[PDB]
Design a binder for these strands. Structure first.
Lengths: 63, 110
RNA sequence: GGACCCGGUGAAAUUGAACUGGCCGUGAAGAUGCGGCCUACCCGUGGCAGGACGAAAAGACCCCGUGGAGCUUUACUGCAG
RNA sequence: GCCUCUAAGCACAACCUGCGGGAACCCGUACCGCAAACCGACACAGGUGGGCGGGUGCAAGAGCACUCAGGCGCGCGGGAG
RNA sequence: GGGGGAUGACCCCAGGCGGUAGGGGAGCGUUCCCGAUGCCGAUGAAGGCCGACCCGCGAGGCGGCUGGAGGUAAGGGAAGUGCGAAUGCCGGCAUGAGUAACGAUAAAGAGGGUGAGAAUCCCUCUCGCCGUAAGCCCAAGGGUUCCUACGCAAUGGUCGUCAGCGUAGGGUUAGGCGGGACCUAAGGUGAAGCCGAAAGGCGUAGCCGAAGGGCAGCCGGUUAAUAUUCCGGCCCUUCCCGC
RNA sequence: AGGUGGAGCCUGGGAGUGAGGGCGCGAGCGAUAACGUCCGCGUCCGAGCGCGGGAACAACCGAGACCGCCAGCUAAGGCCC
RNA sequence: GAGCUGGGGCUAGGAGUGAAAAGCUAACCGAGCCCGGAGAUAGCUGGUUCUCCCCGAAAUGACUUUAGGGUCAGCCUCAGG
RNA sequence: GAGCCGGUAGCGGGCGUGGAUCCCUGGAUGUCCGAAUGGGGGAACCCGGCCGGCGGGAACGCCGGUCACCGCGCUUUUGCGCGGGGGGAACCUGGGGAACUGAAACAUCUCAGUACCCAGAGGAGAGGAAAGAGAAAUCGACUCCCUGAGUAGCGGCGAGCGAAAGGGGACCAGCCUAAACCGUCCGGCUUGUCCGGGCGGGGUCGUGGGGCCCUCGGACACCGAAUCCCCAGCCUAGCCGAAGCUGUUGGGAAGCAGCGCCAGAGAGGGUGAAAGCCCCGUAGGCGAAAGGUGGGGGGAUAGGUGAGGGUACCCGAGUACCCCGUGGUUCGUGGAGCCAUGGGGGAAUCUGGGCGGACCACCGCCUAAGGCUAAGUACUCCGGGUGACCGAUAGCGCACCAGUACCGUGAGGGAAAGGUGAAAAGAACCCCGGGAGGGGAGUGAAAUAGAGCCUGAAACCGUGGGCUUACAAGCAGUCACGGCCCCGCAAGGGGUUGUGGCGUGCCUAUUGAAGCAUGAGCCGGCGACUCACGGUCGUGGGCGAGCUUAAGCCGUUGAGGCGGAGGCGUAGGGAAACCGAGUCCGAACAGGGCGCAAAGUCCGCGGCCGUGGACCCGAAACCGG
């Protein structure tokens, strides 16, 4: 039987039929960061390769 | 009785007469052909195998017990000397003179 | 009084295996077994301890495992009272 | 056990005594037993509680040397030194 | 890899080929399930024992001797499968080694006797060791080890005709000795009573509980063994019926 | 450009070691001391980079071990025994 | 004599007892012993089998209560383009 | 159905077809212990009342039978008559209830409500007609299997834990009582109208019950039992039961050959070496009882409920509901409900009162705060069947004078050890010898099959023979050349070595090893990358929409075949609303994801990855009894 860090599955996660997977930018923001603006324009999404294998897998099945 | 060993279980552990079941057989032409129902046991016959094969003799002792019987004829002598009746391998056993001079013998088998 | 010679009895740890010499050199840096050399018949028993890194025991002194177990206080938390 | 007595029954039949007849069970004993028969896995110079512990000598005394009664020569013997 | 492969195979040359972790491909025997229009063997299943044909090989075949009954699959399937090796587990078997030990330095030696055979048994005569023990006794523990007639295979750290070893037979008797048929402390139980989540805890009286209390005898004889019990002579106690 | 010839690139499954040393050289430290360590450039060994040599000696000079015992040229290194 | 002792019992093993060293608790109690969690976990240690073919490793770098582990890279191998 | 006094084969004696041994079932004895129970007690022993013969009581008095523990009802009277407790491998619910270990620490968490202990029910308990579920105004007992779903979701959001309604399936199934309203009374207070307990009314299934007034209406509706025989199934033995013989190599044949038969029963096993036909009490197939336990099924028992409107109304509970403190639930303090309760307040009887997840309005559901309820799932001590299950170090450890010998005070541990043969025909007799044991004879196919006596290998100890050995080094040894010795694969090889020639053993871990680093004394056998569910690529192949749960049926062999809830692909993009081959950011045509079909899917077989004790053994320790 199987499941998955359901977690990460929650937060950051979720694949495209492409056989690929992505989660939201993730620079700094949302903690400390009076910082700047344009930097703001620094949170869309980030697709990390290689590892996204543990991931996907470990999730595998439903997502 | 549907397995190998349940044969020792309803033959000798059960009714010893079940071993009678063993004294089963036939014999000469007469009697036989005539049928085969209603035995005698300590009757006469003449084996049909083992060196002694094709021999003439009679039924001495219903040994069911040992699992077979003895045939005066069929026998042997020791080494000290004296003669003696050998063991009768139930197997090769023949009976034609169907012991029945005894009205009760003729009222069962022949 | 053993030890030694007789008769009687008759174990035991360790050990891959082995007919296992000294030298001066060497190799993983303290070699009977590798090189050169010198003495060198085959076996034994009564002994004498040096070497076989002899035996005993997978160091207790050491460090390493985000091992364990006991006592301590202004260590953390929690319970008993 | 001895004496005091309620309940209570004796109180010519309750207890004490005297004589005569009658009754008296259950289970334990052998031999070892400062010990090859007991604990130490073994015929292991280890331990194990009570009774006078015979005498002669030593100031006395279960200390001591010899021996009384009784016990035993150790359960492996010779032979060199 | 490439030049034509008919299924093999054959020819060129290029082209290497030492290899532990470790990666890919190919084969071998091992016990089983097929018996994909499969069955051998008393003139041997199989394992064993020994070998100068077949394969790179791990194995094959095959022939000679052994041994008492099996099982083989031409092909695919399945799996408790291949071992020096874990100071591995289990079993046997060698070492040292005919050296180390005889369990207290309280010593023996001689004559006869029995026996197949006696330093190691029996009788006997010298001699040594006890002697507060290497004494008899009561206990506790162990339970036939005790005696008698036979016997030595192993146990006796040598023998062994000896045994506290084997088999057989036999041995231990009590109104008064000890235990009970009497008594309680500790303690343990424990109707009632008291409190636990349940199991349980405590616990009065009464009961269990002993070489503590209490209670009626002793000396001699008598077998291979028993004995205050068996003999006998002497000394008693409790209960019961009668008067 | 390419004489080469046989490495190259992407996708994808299966891995192992995740700590090495030795030598030359250029640097660091260090008594320019160590078979010291510390980074680099090449090699080297990897428990077989097994054989030759330097006596012996992984290892430094030459060498790439498919197999062929009674062929032939050489390497490095040697040719008085 | 806080004397030695037999016999009878009481306490008990995270708790007892202790004229108290952590002693003694059925011959090694710094927390007994048997069965049970259970084949506890165990970067460490060993151990890790029949043949043969093909190629051919790393002992660095980056982050770690991580440094004698292991993630990702770098160097291997096989399938297709 | 004709043999026997059990495994004892041996001596000595005996019962038996005017139905013995033994197979069955129901019996009468059942000594002492053990819940023990009459009383005591270190079990298996020692003690007391009533009856009892009366018994030797030779001119003198005893065992036997018996009897009675204590907690439970209650005919209470002075209490007479019923139940219980002790077990029991595994499985069941309640009562109580833990660390390891994972999280690569560890306090939260996990292992778990597991392991253990306790109580107790049963042959099955568990549970069980709904103050239920959810929302299509849809569903309805409880349970269990598949599925839902590893989803919704819980969380130092880390390791992990991880529901349910709905759909498919097995089964079906429903009932009661306080429940003061009515009347009956019985007992009290003290006469009224109070509480009380036995009788009925009703004694609620899905809202009703009574009490009143008129319509009523005037026989098929059996449960969990109750009942009768019924097929009562089994209970052990029930018994028939097809068909060959000659010849033959053989110590033995059932083999090799010739003819011959069976047949719904060529299942196997025993038969002197392999039979359909020799034995088999087998499958063929029919058989079978007077006693012990069912459904099916037949009947009455049938216990039992079963229609109409109206009325102001009184009638399933002592605590619902609320505050705090825990539980269970997927819920780990949370926006956090339902149900269950530890303490404290302490409502209502049908416009009542909980519920649909804080709460509130409205809608929708349900009617508590007592009880009984077979069947559908679990578990093997028992008996049977079957085996790609084992063969004496494997299997349960234990294939038969083993949970016994044996160490342990105890709890507890806990072994080893099977095989002659066709049957004893098991070795009379003679020999050396105290014997054991060895030499002959005899059984015999063979005893080097010979009494722990089938096969009986190695290691290891012997007896002879070939070769070889005293100026010689290395485990090894292997290459050369020589002599002796044998040529059942001869002009080629065997074996042994005298010399010389080149040579550092073998394993793990190691930068590196001969090793002086460890591993191993020697031989034989055991002994270590497995299985399951998932997922993951590769491949062998069946359809492209592909594919099957659980179950229903069919089943020497037993033959699969139907089952269409589901689940992956059929677009995806997004937190979502939602849009959609387009979409999210945004107010901009600038990018991210995708479109572009290339389409899988099931299965088989594999290299792997997660959960697993899971490559195999290894410790110190923690936790329970």
């Amino acid at each position: 039987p199987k499941m998955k860090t359901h977690k990460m599955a929650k937060r950051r996660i979720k694949i495209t039929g492409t056989g690929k997977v992505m989660a939201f930018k993730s620079g700094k923001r949302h903690q400390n960061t009076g910082k700047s603006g344009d930097e703001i324009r620094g949170k869309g999404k980030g697709f990390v390769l290689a590892k996204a294998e543990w991931a996907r897998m470990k999730l595998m099945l439903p997502r | 009785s549907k397995q190998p060993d349940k044969q020792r279980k309803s033959q000798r552990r059960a009714p010893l007469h079940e071993r009678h079941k063993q004294v089963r057989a036939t014999l000469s032409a007469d009697l036989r052909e005539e049928y085969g129902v209603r035995v005698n046991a300590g009757d006469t016959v003449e084996v049909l195998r083992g060196d002694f094969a094709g021999e003439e003799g009679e039924v001495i002792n219903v040994d069911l017990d040992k699992a077979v019987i003895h045939v005066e004829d069929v026998t042997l002598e020791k080494t000290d000397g004296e003669e003696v009746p050998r063991p009768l391998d139930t197997s090769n056993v023949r009976v034609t003179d169907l012991d029945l001079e005894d009205e009760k013998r003729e009222a069962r088998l022949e």
